[PDB]
Design a binder for these strands. Structure first.
Length: 1168
DNA sequence: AACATTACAAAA
């Protein structure tokens, strides 16, 4: 019967096989993480292990060592739960093959020549590994006996609706004909598995829970592999990325690994493609109607209450601010009425709004759309005003509704956590165990059950969660469609689709949740945010949790690779050629193809079926290809050629194939070498005769082979190598390693042709909304990294919302260096997946589309870990000298300066708008004071900021820079640094700080408050918006406050009714009338109207009655007269004036206080 | 007037 853990008692856990340098790399990198950080902290380790070097062997050996560590810990600690281990990759085939190789490694591992594990130990180790396929394949791999046992054991054998479905599926199973039956069988398998597992979980949740043991337990574990994980029988899981993201079922519920990642280990193969896989999963979420959701939340949170039992302790306080916000919002926007549209152009096309939620907002409407409540009609109408009214906009309403909805979801997450805490306290059982019960209890107390599904999905994508850091990767985007409701022509809905995080945010969340992640890929650290994770963001967010290899470790890996791929010492030569298009060569070949035709254009248009418009394009990619083939046929020693194109040569282009075939035959006859061709070698072809035919032909026939495939067809685990027959091959082969004829003798592709990859922007074919979200995510990621300026990104977003074509999106993308990095990544993967063996020809021919040369000449990374073919390509490209290109870092600096300035401008405008809205909030006052305090304390910072990163920009100079833009105009038109040699300059001298602090009163105040008296010469300096609108005002306010306090004045906090209208209130000698103060840092024109000042004064007196008003200037010339003004800002006598103006408190020539002005102010107060 | 495609996973 099943092997037990008591069979490892005499096993020695210190005896290990001789470790390869890669194993040392992994272990040495991971040990310093446990030293520097703790044992409970996660890590992210990207390992650039290229294919053929033994990366799968290394990963599986690491996994086996983790298994042995778990067994040793269990023996020593004789009940801690098992540490979960996951092997994740994109493809199902790679998962199955990796599990097979792990089992083989367990079976056939030897130490010092003796077998490492006994039969019982081998069986026990194999019992801990489980594979989690999709539900259809899970059902179809279970025998009828197992399913009958499961149905009998759970009393489902008499339900009719269950037995009919199972009988139908069994009948389909016993009649497995051509795949026409198989598609239907798979669909019904999925549906039946869903229904059966739902019923089983419902039965197990209730009181009449079936006891599982013996044969029933075995059958259930066969049907539900996750039950093995839940019980503790297994702790190693092989699964795909999508399966990992969705989760798997056990007898209780659906287990989500993302919610239980503390302590787990992930081995992610081909990590850089998981970015695209995760994005595709994220873009499939369900859209929400915001009007319905907000109306439901407002209606149900008005009255319904939670129970006051100890299980709900301090949970009700989590929801009170949401209730107040909902009630205020519903009062403001009149949610008692339904919504509709009226006007021209609002009916033919629905309204589309896009928001990045911070500073990028785009609308499909040509004119701003307004929102007005008609009380006579009892309606909320969306208008188009053909004539700025801040209140009453559709964008404001949509943004606030989205904020409230996300707030509700986050509060539900917090309440679930609190409920788990309380339940742990009482019944003394994990977070994943009480999650569903908590959600159900909370939603049924509030009568909000219809949000159930939504909440679950939220906890999937935001239950994985240093706060005021701003980044697209953890805020996301929102796409809203306003359109008429279905079936009714007088109401509208606002369907919103969200991306609450990017794939990089998901990865950072997993690392911060305590998971240790090993990402294995040769292009793991590529410089693309489209085809890879954003590693700048990951670095910023993780710090030392993002591990890396030292120079010595990299050199060890390089030495190992060179020792296993010694080319130079074994006489292997890589010949690289760049092929330009040749019109005369193709013309001659075409004329020979059809000698009776008049011109080659006639043959192209009529015989090959090429439309006249596309002929030129076909004349470029054909001739080049043909040229390569010719150079392959005239080569004597070469046998195997792979041609990587962008389009497959299936029967759809059959005519073209014939032409190529003709040419091949001719060239064969010209060079007396047999040549076989394999057209249309794609994935469906491999599902049929499966690339074994090419290997057999190379093994049994003495001719050349040319294979026509694409980049997409050559996956990670395709392995295009053949068995060598030394009779057919001459003496050309060379062994480049030191292994003693390891097992079979295999060779690889010998000649390769590479085309320039084309469709390098991702797309989603799941639905129109998923594709829209994918495109918007790509634009926003490019803006976040700095590849795009905010103006270019906003224009691109506007075009995407208008609905442009893919060609225009590709043209937009081609202007970025991210595009070149993606091209080079594709080339590197292509040349790396073709050197998987150790037997090499005398000459290896690389033929490259010439359009790649200018790209490949721009490679600048360390070639310490590049493959030999890639190094040869780069050297051949660079052999043409150097070309003048724009530095990526400098352009990114300019773009990021513009981005930070624009974000700061829009954020400051929104904050000021929220402040001038009575009644104000308290978080807004806190944010305003925190911004001012941070700028005062740290005008410049040395390290990259974390909490206030958008208040600063990185300048090429230290402590100062130049700019030219209108701070009250368009944020997209700002220019920075050397682009504006003569422009407004931001530094310590332009703010007159040094002269200000020289005064005897302000300086002690600055010291006791901690404010900087000078600017450190640093690279991070505040953006122009904060320098002009925040920093100078703070300097003036602090100087005035210090000067007045030194003269025995008292200050109190301004209340929210008049906030930001006046900085402080003056209290002196107990004058019972209120005194109001407003300061300007230096002499500047009063752009605010005198009527505006009168409006402010009248508004203030409307709440506080008569009072005194002071307008003071902190710094200036102290010889100017002291003015008295009336409510209309007209000069009046001191016996009737209400406004007192102080031109300067400290002189700008000697930093001397205007004590005469202070004495006159004191006398004025005594005259009141 | 730009650019010029295939491939996959979990299903409900």
């Amino acid at each position: 019967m099943n092997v037990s853990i008591e069979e490892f008692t005499h096993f020695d856990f210190q005896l290990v096989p001789e470790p390869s340098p890669l194993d040392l790399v992994i272990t040495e990198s991971l040990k310093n993480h446990i030293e520097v950080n703790g044992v409970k902290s996660g890590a992210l380790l990207p390992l650039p292990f290229q294919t053929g070097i033994g990366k799968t062997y290394t990963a599986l050996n690491f996994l086996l060592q983790q298994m042995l560590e778990q067994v040793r810990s269990e023996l020593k600690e004789e009940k801690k739960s098992k540490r979960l281990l996951y092997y994740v990759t994109d493809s199902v085939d790679n998962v199955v093959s990796a599990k097979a190789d792990l089992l083989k490694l367990i079976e056939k591992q030897t130490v010092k020549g003796e077998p490492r594990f006994t039969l019982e130990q081998q069986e026990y180790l194999k019992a801990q590994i489980v594979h989690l396929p999709n539900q259809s394949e899970q059902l179809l791999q279970c025998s009828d006996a197992v399913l009958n046992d499961v149905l009998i054991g759970f009393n489902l054998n008499a339900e009719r609706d269950v037995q009919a479905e199972w009988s139908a599926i069994s009948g389909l199973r016993r009649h497995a004909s051509n795949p026409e039956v198989k598609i239907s069988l798979n669909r019904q398998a999925g549906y039946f598995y869903r229904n059966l597992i739902d019923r089983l979980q419902k039965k197990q949740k209730g009181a009449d829970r079936v006891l599982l043991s013996g044969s029933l337990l075995a059958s259930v574990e066969t049907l539900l592999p996750g039950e093995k994980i839940r019980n503790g029988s297994a702790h190693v899981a092989f699964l795909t990325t999508s399966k990992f993201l969705k989760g798997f079922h056990n007898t209780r519920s659906r287990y989500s690994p993302l919610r239980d990642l503390s302590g787990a280990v992930l081995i992610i193969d081909e990590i850089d493609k998981q970015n695209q896989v995760i994005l595709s999963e994220l873009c499939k979420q369900q859209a929400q109607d915001l009007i319905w959701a907000i109306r439901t939340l407002r209606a149900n949170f008005r009255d319904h209450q939670l129970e006051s039992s100890p299980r709900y302790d301090k949970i009700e306080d989590l929801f009170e601010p949401l209730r107040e916000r909902l009630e205020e919002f519903g009062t403001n926007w009149n949610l008692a009425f339904a919504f509709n549209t009226e006007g021209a152009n609002l009916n033919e096309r629905p309204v589309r709004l896009f928001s990045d939620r911070s500073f990028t907002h785009v609308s499909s409407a040509t004119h701003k759309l307004s929102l007005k409540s008609d009380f006579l009609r009892r309606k909320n109408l969306i208008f188009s005003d053909e004539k700025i009214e801040k209140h009453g906009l559709l964008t404001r309403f949509v943004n606030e509704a989205d904020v409230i909805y996300q707030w509700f979801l986050g509060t539900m997450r917090k309440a679930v956590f609190q409920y788990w805490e309380n339940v742990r306290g009482l019944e003394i059982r994990s977070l994943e165990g009480t999650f569903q019960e908590a959600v159900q209890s909370l939603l049924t107390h509030f009568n909000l059950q219809e949000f159930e599904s939504a909440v679950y999905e939220s906890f999937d994508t935001r239950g994985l969660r240093l706060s005021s850091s701003k980044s697209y990767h953890h805020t996301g985007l929102k796409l809203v469609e306003v359109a008429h409701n279905q079936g009714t022509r007088d109401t509208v809905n606002c369907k919103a689709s969200f991306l609450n995080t990017s794939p990089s945010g998901v990865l950072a969340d997993m690392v911060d949740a305590g998971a240790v992640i090993l990402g294995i890929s040769a292009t793991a650290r590529a410089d693309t945010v489209i085809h890879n994770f954003d590693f700048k963001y990951l670095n910023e967010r993780l710090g030392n949790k993002l591990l890396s290899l030292s120079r010595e470790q990299k050199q060890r890996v390089n030495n190992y690779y060179h020792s296993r791929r010694n080319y130079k010492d074994n006489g292997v030569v890589l010949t690289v050629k760049y092929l330009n298009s040749r019109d005369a060569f193709l013309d001659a070949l075409l004329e020979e193809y059809k000698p009776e035709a008049r011109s080659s254009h006639f043959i192209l248009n009529h015989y090959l079926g090429i439309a006249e418009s596309e002929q030129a394009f076909v004349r470029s990619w054909l001739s080049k290809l043909l040229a390569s083939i010719k150079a392959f046929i005239s080569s004597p020693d070469n046998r195997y050629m792979l041609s990587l194109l962008n389009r497959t040569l299936d029967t759809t282009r059959q005519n073209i194939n014939d032409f190529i075939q003709f040419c091949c035959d001719k060239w064969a006859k010209e060079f007396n070498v047999k040549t076989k061709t394999f057209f249309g070698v794609n994935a469906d072809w491999m599902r049929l005769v499966g690339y074994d035919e090419i290997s057999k032909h190379l093994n049994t026939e003495l001719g050349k082979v040319v294979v026509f495939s694409t980049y997409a067809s050559m996956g990670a685990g395709k392995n295009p190598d053949y068995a060598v027959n030394l009779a057919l091959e001459g003496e050309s082969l060379i062994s480049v390693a030191d292994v003693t004829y390891s097992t079979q003798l295999r060779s690889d592709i010998d000649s390769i042709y590479l085309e320039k990859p084309t469709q390098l922007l991702l797309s989603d074919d799941y639905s129109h909304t998923a594709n829209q979200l994918c495109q918007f995510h790509q634009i926003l990621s490019l803006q976040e990294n700095g590849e795009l300026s905010p103006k270019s990104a906003e224009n691109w977003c506007r075009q995407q919302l208008m609905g442009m074509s893919r060609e225009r999106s590709l043209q937009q993308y081609h202007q970025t260096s991210d595009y070149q990095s993606a091209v080079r990544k594709y080339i590197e993967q292509a040349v790396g997946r073709a050197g998987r063996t150790s037997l090499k020809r005398k000459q290896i021919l690389l033929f490259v589309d010439s359009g790649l040369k200018e790209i490949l000449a721009e490679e600048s990374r360390d070639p310490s870990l590049f493959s030999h073919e890639y190094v040869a390509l780069v050297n051949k490209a660079k052999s043409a000298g150097k070309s003048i290109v724009e530095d990526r870092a400098v352009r990114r600096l300019f773009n990021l300066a513009q981005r930070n300035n624009k974000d700061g401008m829009l954020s400051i405008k929104a904050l000021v708008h929220r402040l001038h809205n009575q009644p104000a909030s308290k978080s807004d006052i806190q944010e305003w004071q925190d911004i001012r305090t941070q700028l005062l304390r740290y005008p410049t910072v040395a390290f990259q900021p974390e909490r206030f990163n958008r208040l600063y920009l990185q300048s090429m100079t230290k402590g100062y820079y130049r700019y030219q833009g209108n701070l009250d105009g368009d944020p997209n038109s700002f220019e920075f640094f050397d682009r504006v040699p003569y422009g407004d300059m931001v530094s310590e001298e332009d703010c007159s700080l040094a002269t200000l602090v020289q005064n005897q009163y302000v300086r002690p105040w600055f010291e006791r408050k901690g404010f900087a008296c000078s600017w450190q010469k640093e690279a991070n300096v505040m953006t122009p918006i904060m320098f002009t609108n925040i920093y100078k005002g703070a300097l003036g306010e602090q100087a005035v406050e210090a000067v007045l306090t030194a003269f025995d004045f008292t200050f109190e906090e301004v209340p929210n009714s008049i906030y930001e209208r006046f900085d402080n209130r003056v209290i002196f000698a107990g004058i019972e009338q209120p005194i109001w103060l407003d300061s300007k840092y230096w002499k500047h024109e009063g752009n605010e109207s005198s009527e505006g000042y009168s409006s402010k004064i009248a508004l203030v007196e409307e709440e506080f009655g008569p009072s005194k008003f002071i307008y003071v200037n902190a710094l200036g010339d102290t010889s100017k007269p002291i003015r008295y003004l009336n409510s209309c800002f007209v000069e009046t006598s001191p016996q009737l004036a209400k406004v007192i103006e102080i031109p300067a408190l400290i002189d700008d020539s000697n930093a001397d206080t205007n004590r005469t002005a202070v004495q006159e102010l004191i006398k004025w107060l005594h005259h009141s």
